[PDB]
Design an enzyme around this catalytic site. Structure first.
Site, mmCIF file in Angstrom:
data_model
loop_
_atom_site.group_PDB
_atom_site.id
_atom_site.type_symbol
_atom_site.label_atom_id
_atom_site.label_comp_id
_atom_site.label_asym_id
_atom_site.label_seq_id
_atom_site.Cartn_x
_atom_site.Cartn_y
_atom_site.Cartn_z
ATOM 1 C CG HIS A 96 -2.506 0.590 0.967
ATOM 2 N ND1 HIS A 96 -3.475 -0.235 1.688
ATOM 3 C CD2 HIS A 96 -2.776 0.851 -0.544
ATOM 4 C CE1 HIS A 96 -4.189 1.411 0.868
ATOM 5 N NE2 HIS A 96 -4.268 1.654 0.152
ATOM 6 C CG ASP A 119 -6.074 -0.074 5.163
ATOM 7 O OD1 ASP A 119 -5.738 -1.752 5.812
ATOM 8 O OD2 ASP A 119 -4.966 -0.331 4.474
ATOM 9 C CG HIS A 121 -4.130 -2.426 9.083
ATOM 10 N ND1 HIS A 121 -4.143 -3.520 7.963
ATOM 11 C CD2 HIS A 121 -3.802 -3.517 10.003
ATOM 12 C CE1 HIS A 121 -3.681 -4.485 8.431
ATOM 13 N NE2 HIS A 121 -3.755 -4.031 9.828
ATOM 14 C CG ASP A 123 -2.287 1.368 5.754
ATOM 15 O OD1 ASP A 123 -2.145 0.849 6.019
ATOM 16 O OD2 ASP A 123 -2.185 0.885 4.689
ATOM 17 C CG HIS A 136 2.924 -1.392 4.364
ATOM 18 N ND1 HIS A 136 2.187 -3.590 4.068
ATOM 19 C CD2 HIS A 136 4.090 -1.525 5.207
ATOM 20 C CE1 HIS A 136 2.392 -3.637 5.364
ATOM 21 N NE2 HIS A 136 2.880 -3.139 6.351
ATOM 22 C CG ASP A 227 -4.971 -3.582 2.767
ATOM 23 O OD1 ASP A 227 -4.911 -4.354 2.475
ATOM 24 O OD2 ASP A 227 -3.923 -2.890 3.186
ATOM 25 C CG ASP A 229 -5.671 -5.130 5.036
ATOM 26 O OD1 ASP A 229 -3.598 -5.254 5.356
ATOM 27 O OD2 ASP A 229 -5.801 -4.572 5.132
ATOM 28 C CD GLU A 272 0.013 -4.452 1.353
ATOM 29 O OE1 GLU A 272 0.572 -6.103 1.434
ATOM 30 O OE2 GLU A 272 0.809 -2.882 1.509
HETATM 31 CO CO LIG Z 1 -3.131 -1.364 3.657
HETATM 32 CO CO LIG Z 2 -4.345 -3.129 6.014
#
Ligand SMILES: [Co+2]
Ligand SMILES: [Co+2]
Ligand SMILES: [Co+2]
Ligand SMILES: [Co+2]
Ligand SMILES: [Co+2]
Ligand SMILES: [Co+2]
Lengths: 314, 314, 314
Positions: A96, A119, A121, A123, A136, A227, A229, A272
């Protein structure tokens, strides 16, 4: 919908190898073909050839800053190029960190864009808050104007100019945020819908409020940084930092279908995806197939069915 | 949040051995450490030493009444003790029969508490309605004032005094209720949200209505009795009576986060975790990790992220 | 609720053998017994004996038209018979082509019925739009009055008379619809809730709007045609055309419980169960158990619990 595909085989923003292969496995699954069959005029700009960065030495805790920085710098130029050719930029990549180049490049042609960040997260760690040094997990920090003074000059990012405001971004799916990130998140008053908000409100309301927030005052180009994830590892297990209790396959497809119907999708990141990180071959296929289904939905693929404007029965 | 941990390694309320290990596997996973790292002042009262009960003979169909009764009697005293020390009581145990002691002990110090029962079952069979005789399926019957006359004097529970009213309890997650239990449930007009209600309303509305019902007239201490089988066995498979179509991991975390934010959590039970009942080692870890995540959320752990009141960037 | 069970062991509407066994595996699991225990007066009309069809030659691209047609023709007569005996018709079968006979037969006795079609597909291809020729994907085309002139006279269906209007049917769960089908779907203004609508609105609102649409003007007999592939393959994997991202077990049970409470369920189809299509024995059991749970819910089985009108404590 007119599209411009850019492959970004880079993984130096993070420690797990295999993400550079995202572009290839995604093309392998037939992404370009599938888009064509759909309502799309696709053009492939190929895979960005990321060269070697000599003194690619760690800047303090920050790893591969020059590589990551140069990588995003090149991507930015490529995206800017596709946006000038009147096409929606479709970035297929590794980690990312590349969002730095994708969004920056996009903002050059469309400075009024709004960002949707799916995401698990934020980030948003800065080179000063990150505990790992992996870029990332810091892209958002380099793009925000608000943090223009809270971020050191890292080797490789001299070309970076904070292009978006904290009010021009919305997160969806958060469930693993660092204390340092949460402080910034809250402090800057950034709009977010953690899994908590998704549970409470439902994805329909979540999307409604996400789009209302970003396009309320006026319509503007939308950039979707996705992302994989962000979705639950039961659907996208072949990825570096998976977190349980994430977006379901349905919610992932609902998010994109919604964005598609705004008619404002202007930039897209599919990041990702790591083909090397599956516990089994099937886990890899599952993850790739899900990434594709998500992309296809961003460009028109609807679950209720599709067809063009004419008479079918003849 | 100030906490007082009590371990209740007891399984005589039910027929499947292994539940006595709940306290150990939960501590093993690092529950105390994790709470500390969080915003918590934790104190361990150790694991209650449940002694042998001589003539522990079955009372009619009721099994191990003296053991189960004495076990709850001791727990009650311990909980009462922690509530007097100004701490939220955290009971880690075996079967749900222990809720008799946990709630009774809690009600002694805070007679105005309201109960939230997350379970796939009502555990409201009486010694007269139960078809199995297992006390982990009858706790609620001994605690309700309404049933003060519909329940025989069972050896081992002479010390019990119905401490809560049918209007001071709310069920969430029901999906396997006996005809005898349903009759009582409906008859007493008890507030409940079966999986049907969760499906219809959504967990956000479910929590809203659960809390409105219990704290509408006035704020009061909240006791959360959590049977891990309330969640779907895909998340908590290592448990005695698993039922399909239950609460998702997300809904489980949403329930606790909500309760946490009321600021009224006063007693907590984490029951029915059986380390011996997994089809694979992974199933055991999954179940334990989920139980921990649920507990952590009751005490502050938020999916959107956490941090204390100060300046992080310095 | 009074019931009349009809077994339809037929699979010529589609290419994958094993669906003819649906009736047997469902009875094997104890469906009749389970209904009896419930609030039900069940009568078994046995399994329709589908004879050989000589010149069962393909009509253009359409396969086994005579067999499929004759099969539905016989079913229709049997259903008409059970509806005359004052019973709800319960069809256990092979492929969905049989819905032609089930609904047609039902409409003869109750011409004002409304249809609820739970499927991942619209099964509305015409002999002219179908790309496979399989009749299990075209049932709806033969039943709609609107398409009375857009459908060739196929050998074996001379007995068919479009019995329902496009406004008397509602789809729930669509996620794999052909361009030809989508054109018809949209063109005829048929009411539908694709997985997109289910995601947006929630199953509670979905059911509310489904029932409002069908019974708004006036109450009328309801026919539920349930294709087990409407649910996600994680619950019903042993089926011919599984599609990911479908109805969850909970949503499947919520749909039926709702229909049950209308008090208007008049016809029920439980189709596409294929015992031979599991990757493992468990996948077969899972699919069969889910099909049963769905049927039981249509006839009274509630997740909150059940009991009859009397005193239990004595
Ligand atoms: Co990310
Ligand atoms: Co992530
Ligand atoms: Co239980
Ligand atoms: Co329980
Ligand atoms: Co189907
Ligand atoms: Co079908």
């Amino acid at each position: 919908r007119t599209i411009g595909i850019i492959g970004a085989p880079f993984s130096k923003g993070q420690p797990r190898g295999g993400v550079e292969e995202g572009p290839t496995v995604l093309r392998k699954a037939g992404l370009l073909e599938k888009l064509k069959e759909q309502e799309c005029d696709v053009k492939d700009y190929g895979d960005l050839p990321f060269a070697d960065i000599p003194n690619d030495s760690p800047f303090q805790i920050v790893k591969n800053p020059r590589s990551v920085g140069k990588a995003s710098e090149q991507l930015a130029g490529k995206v800017a190029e596709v946006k000038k050719n009147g096409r929606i930029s479709l970035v297929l990549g590794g980690d990312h960190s590349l969002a730095i180049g994708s969004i920056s490049g996009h903002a050059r042609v469309h400075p009024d864009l709004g960002v949707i960040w799916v995401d698990a997260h934020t980030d948003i760690n800065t080179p000063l808050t990150t505990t790992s040094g992996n870029l990332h997990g810091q892209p958002v920090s380099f793009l925000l104007k608000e943090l223009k003074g809270k971020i050191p000059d890292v080797p490789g990012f001299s070309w970076v100019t904070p292009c978006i405001s904290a009010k021009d971004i919305v997160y969806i799916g958060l469930r693993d945020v660092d204390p340092g990130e949460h402080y910034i998140l809250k402090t800057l008053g950034i709009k977010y819908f953690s899994m908590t908000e998704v549970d409470r409100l439902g994805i329909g309301k979540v999307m409604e409020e996400t789009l209302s927030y970003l396009l309320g005052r006026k319509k503007r180009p939308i950039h979707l940084s996705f992302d994989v994830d962000g979705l639950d590892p039961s659907f996208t297990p072949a990825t570096g930092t998976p977190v349980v209790g994430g977006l379901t396959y349905r919610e992932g497809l609902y998010i994109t279908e919604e964005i598609y119907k705004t008619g404002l999708l202007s930039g897209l990141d599919i990041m990702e995806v790591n083909p090397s990180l599956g516990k089994t071959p099937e886990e890899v296929t599952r993850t790739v197939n899900t990434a594709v289904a998500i992309t296809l939905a961003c460009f028109g693929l609807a679950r209720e069915g599709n067809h063009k404007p004419i008479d079918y029965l003849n």
